[PDB]
Amino acid sequence: MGHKIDTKEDMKILYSEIAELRKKLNLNHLEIDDTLEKVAKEYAIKLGENRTITHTLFGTTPMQRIHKYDQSFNLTREILASGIELNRVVNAWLNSPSHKEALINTDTDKIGGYRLKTTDNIDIFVVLFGKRK
């Protein structure tokens, strides 16, 4: 895998876009969560190293990946994207019924994600949603 590029600013844009979408629907406000951000980043790097996009890499599930760091999450969702520009990704997820369901969910109060963008043209979003016990 090539070198990673900083995407902090990208994720600030994306969080803001998702927040505005949810606000226009009068849905609940999601707070950015450090644990979800760490899990999303670790997973995004594995997806990129292994040349795949999948929710079940190495026999893990999104809940299980989050429970490795914090077992108090009792409800979670995961959305992925690859090869899609930042200013197109929300609409690309809205066009998928299962992805749209996650973006407009009322079950979770926390969000955290990561964008992997590398020098060899890997471009992956991982966005997680969660609710703690």
Side-chain angles (χ1 to χ4, degrees), residues 101-125:
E101 198 282 335
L103 290 174
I104 67 167
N105 86 272
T106 57
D107 294 349
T108 58
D109 59 355
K110 301 300 174 171
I111 192 175
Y114 182 75
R115 187 198 195 170
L116 173 72
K117 196 177 167 180
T118 68
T119 50
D120 58 348
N121 291 23
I122 296 166
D123 185 351
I124 295 175
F125 296 97

Side-chain angles (χ1 to χ4, degrees), residues 3-123:
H3 298 286
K4 292 182 292 297
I5 300 164
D6 188 326
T7 52
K8 195 174 179 210
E9 186 62 41
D10 299 343
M11 289 300 306
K12 174 175 218 307
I13 290 161
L14 180 57
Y15 285 140
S16 181
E17 198 177 14
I18 292 171
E20 203 57 85
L21 165 77
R22 293 172 62 80
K23 179 177 196 186
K24 289 339 173 20
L25 292 166
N26 214 17
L27 297 171
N28 59 297
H29 184 255
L30 300 172
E31 289 180 5
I32 298 162
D33 180 86
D34 294 330
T35 301
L36 293 183
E37 282 194 323
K38 182 204 309 167
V39 177
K41 181 180 187 179
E42 288 192 5
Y43 198 56
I45 285 166
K46 296 193 175 160
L47 294 176
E49 288 177 325
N50 285 279
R51 308 184 213 164
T52 184
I53 297 293
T54 174
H55 294 280
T56 57
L57 182 71
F58 310 144
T60 66
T61 185
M63 188 104 64
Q64 184 168 337
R65 286 190 296 273
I66 296 162
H67 282 172
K68 157 169 183 188
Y69 294 110
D70 186 343
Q71 237 172 279
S72 61
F73 287 95
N74 59 338
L75 207 143
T76 193
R77 297 151 184 287
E78 174 176 86
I79 56 178
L80 313 171
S82 179
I84 303 169
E85 298 299 331
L86 175 64
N87 67 354
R88 294 312 202 131
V89 72
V90 168
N91 284 332
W93 284 320
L94 291 171
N95 177 55
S96 178
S98 60
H99 316 142
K100 178 167 173 169
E101 198 282 335
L103 290 174
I104 67 167
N105 86 272
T106 57
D107 294 349
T108 58
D109 59 355
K110 301 300 174 171
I111 192 175
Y114 182 75
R115 187 198 195 170
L116 173 72
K117 196 177 167 180
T118 68
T119 50
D120 58 348
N121 291 23
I122 296 166
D123 185 351

